[PDB]
Amino acid sequence: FGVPHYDETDTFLGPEGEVLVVADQPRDESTLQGINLGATFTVTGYRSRLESHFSRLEYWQPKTTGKTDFWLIYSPDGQVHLLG
Amino acid sequence: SAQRLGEIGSDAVTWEKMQPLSVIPSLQSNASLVDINGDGQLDWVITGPGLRGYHSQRPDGSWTRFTPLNALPVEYTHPRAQLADLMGAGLSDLVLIGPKSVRLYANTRDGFAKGKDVVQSGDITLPVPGADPRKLVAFSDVLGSGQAHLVEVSATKVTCWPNLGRGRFGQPITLPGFSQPATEFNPAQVYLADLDGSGPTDLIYVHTNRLDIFLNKSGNGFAEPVTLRFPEGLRFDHTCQLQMADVQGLGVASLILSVPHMSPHHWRCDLTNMKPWLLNEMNNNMGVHHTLRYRSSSQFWLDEKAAALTTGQTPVCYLPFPIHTLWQTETEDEIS
Amino acid sequence: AEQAYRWELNDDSARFIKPGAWQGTYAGLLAGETLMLSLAQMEDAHLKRDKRALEVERTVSLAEVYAGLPKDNGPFSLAQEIDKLVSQGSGSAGSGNNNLAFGAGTDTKTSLQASVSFADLKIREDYPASLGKIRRIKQISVTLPALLGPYQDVQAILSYGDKAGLANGCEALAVSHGMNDSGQFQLDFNDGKFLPFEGIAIDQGTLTLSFPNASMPEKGKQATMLKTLNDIILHIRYTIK
Amino acid sequence: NNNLAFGAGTDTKTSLQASVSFADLKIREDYPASLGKIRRIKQISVTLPALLGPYQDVQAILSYGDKAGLANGCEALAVSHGMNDSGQFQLDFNDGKFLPFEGIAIDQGTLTLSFPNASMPEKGKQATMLKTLNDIILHIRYTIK
Amino acid sequence: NNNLAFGAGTDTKTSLQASVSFADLKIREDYPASLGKIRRIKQISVTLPALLGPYQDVQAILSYGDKAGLANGCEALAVSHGMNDSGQFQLDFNDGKFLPFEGIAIDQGTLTLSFPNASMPEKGKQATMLKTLNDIILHIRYTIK
Amino acid sequence: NNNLAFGAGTDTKTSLQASVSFADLKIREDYPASLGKIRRIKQISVTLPALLGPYQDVQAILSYGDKAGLANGCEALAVSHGMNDSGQFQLDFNDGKFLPFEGIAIDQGTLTLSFPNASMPEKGKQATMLKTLNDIILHIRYTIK
Amino acid sequence: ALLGPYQDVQAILSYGDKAGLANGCEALAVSHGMNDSGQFQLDFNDGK
Amino acid sequence: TWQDNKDVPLTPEDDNSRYWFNRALKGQLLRSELYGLDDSTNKHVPYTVTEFRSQVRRLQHTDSRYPVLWSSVVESRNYHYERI
């Protein structure tokens, strides 16, 4: 529906081509699997508008300024994927 | 309206005898039929002194009773104001263009957003439509990106300013390959259409008894033009029209010329019989060959409609999109 | 001319023409000259009272007005009440001078009409008193956002039921197509004559708009066109001085 | 004389006003002295690049602060729609009467534009509209002698 | 009286003219005699379907019959755009003066249109413009009395 | 008389001027001598192809370099926008008065078009306007008799 | 939609009881077909 | 709607909701028939009829612009006629 704002109002799509609804409340996290990320990240869970897999997606944002963001996907079969 | 000509399944298409319509939107003045909502319907949009609204042409051949707009820009009717998708929403935004900035009011479907003045960066200077009678200024997807870009066509070159959204444009580039003598060149003779059909819009120049097609190399300039000739007597002048539409349901626009003189006379030119670049053959070199054929969704509609005509039904198409679908395939065994 | 003078200026106290210009004793000699002077005096007064009044265009949504009636008056949706009324040729909506009804006169029993008071429109609130106290109507246009059959027109009469010093025939206006319609085939402000409703005060008086043969049970004509009408729009041009 | 404020008059307190000095606009400097030193206003039109809702009309008046010898009513102009607007239903340069602001030197004086019912918290009406406005544009038609 | 030719006058040899016969046009037979026998031209406009550049003008003069029966200047009409052109910068039926060709009976005489600078070997300018002239359309406004 | 220059007057040094002779426009040659000899200008309109945005005006003046017999003010025309512009806010061929440049023989004298305050080093206001000026088009309405 | 811009209509509209009309007001020329009239210009303020 | 971990029958409110609920089912095969094409009288009956009943369960509806829905075929049939 148009060029993104590159801010919190943007709607994101998951890999299957679908709207990601904030699924849950944000939390902070400084590590991942024990790795010190070097920044505090705010982590928001997401779920696709139309469900068909029930994977959980997370958007991590570098609350501590200086790092970049990233996304994680937690697969129903236990796989974990990191993107961007 | 349009109808299947001949037997159901025939590729032929014709037109129905014009009928008066049972419902007229009224409020004819200061209005036009456009999909302002971007809903897949056309809205008879009226503007003026307390006139802020529309009637809607429903796909079922009926009308929505008058609906007001939530917000109409004062400048909506301003001379030189354009309607174009500059937000990228597929909605036509209202915009005014000067050489260094644009004024845009985003189309929010039910009306327009508070507009903003967008200042262009650097040395980017925008063409201003109407600024120079010798040049054509228009929005077109000359890059084949799915978005219209602002383009200027002169006798010697084509310059284009990429649409970056919200009325912002990128650094202009030159698209070489288009050329006409400066003396002969006249924007009125310049047409834009994706005759190729893959996305980038081709540049077309019309001459009496002939037409030059400059294929658009995906925004990288143009091919040397193919000159086509018109049939004897099909002369072209300033009163003559040129339309481009997929009247044949081939997924490719055909060209139609008309001569209003001595009763309107019309001619069509097809450049194909099939949509270019679709995958239509496959062969594994182990004796198995495949062939694929496609048809516009609009052809299937003509037949759905035709069947209804024989069953006395009045079906409704809810899809104003003449997109190809796969129609037929075959698998051939080279051995047996 | 004296009456025209008074009307234009919103001042009916003015007087220039006096009796006795014609004296029987003197056989009326100089009666003409006497009148010529009075006319010049009138003209002078006109010129010295005139000003370039400001032109204000104010549109009105009837539906908004009816929708907005005080609870006590009983607000309603204009479009909805109309449809009930074309089906019910004996019904009514609204109250006071802000309502819908079929006309009472025999000729009007199948005519659906709406009425509204200027007092409720309260146009005066748009501008400070200090900008001019006299606010009077110049011209009223009508728009009817409804659908029509193939070549069907729409019939209606706009009128002011409070006719007073208003010039003969200026108590009413024809409507045929809407779209900023008027009672003229050609609207011309330099016609030299007064336009319908011209000189009516902004603060008071009642207008009505009548659609003949709006009763559906009687198989009328407007009944089916009214069915598709979502609002009534007035375009009221008035001036301030 | 180049500012924004609400009007001081009792029934103008909720009217938002904007004002500008013609001297500060320096229109005069746009043309050479040799073309003549008499540069005066013939007419002013007004454009208001805002958005209007279904029945939202513009309530605004443009006026010259000092009547300065003008004929009655020439001190001001109404605005109703905002696109190259004017104070009269028909603009006619051959009308025969003087137009609003006609004869004012472009050289000086303060012009003001009034917007009644602009105060939002006091239940304004134009106030909603005014928020959608991006600029104020004047079209000053003047002549040189 | 239905032909094309280059003119024979001193300054007409590079000018190509076309001409037609009113008698052959037979406009008269379009309506019944019972309507009145008098049918006369009020005005003539010209359309010249052709392809001209943004600033390329048409050079052509329309003229008729024996000028002796006409008011001065009514013997001819200028053509410049070929777009329902009249020979006037402004067409006005209430002008008070006779229009070009006004009062000519539709029944007779020869009408002609002349294009100067039409000889290609002489480097005429109309000479190349005319390669795209598809037709000459006359629009005749006439009336029955 | 076919050149460009900055003006030499005291208030013109920042004014870019264009000058053209009438004689070299060779208008006369468009039509046969036998068509008429008195060929004089009735009205001139001006187009200045340039990137003038929605509210961007242009200050430009066209004048006759040999005022002689012209009524006061007919020596010049003021361009405000450059799109078939003209010498008045309302054009009316029935105005009752003579138009700018009216009566000038089509091949005599010279015209000059000024662009005031346009020199870039001087921060002329129009300097950026001229950067986009791609031509100067004159539209001359004249008559033959 | 009967005709295009370069085709003409030859037709006459007339009223039977012409007795009360001024000479020529008994009929209307038809030649255009689009809200036309029997005159080249229409002006309701015309003195005739 | 999913409530207290129960599959609860729902009348889908207004048009906004109805839209998302119906949207969730797009592309779902609802019926399929296999019909022979020959000159026998059996050409007037299918060999088989397959039917599906789809459902949509509402799971989340915080950001109401894009409600989270899940869908599947709740039930299906297979009729065998053999053109009888």
From TrEMBL, chain B:
Annotated localization: Secreted
Domain Insecticide toxin TcdB middle/N-terminal: residue ranges: 219-336
Name this polypeptide is given: TcdB2
Protein source organism: Photorhabdus luminescens (Xenorhabdus luminescens)
Higher taxonomy: Bacteria, Pseudomonadati, Pseudomonadota, Gammaproteobacteria, Enterobacterales
Parent sequence residues shown: 421 to 756 of 1474
TrEMBL record, chain G:
Annotated protein name in UniProt: TcdA1
Residues of the full protein shown: 2421 to 2468 of 2516
UniProtKB/TrEMBL annotation, chain H:
Compartments it resides in: Secreted
Superkingdom of origin: Bacteria
Protein name: TcdB2
Organism: Photorhabdus luminescens (Xenorhabdus luminescens)
Gene this chain is encoded by: tcdB2
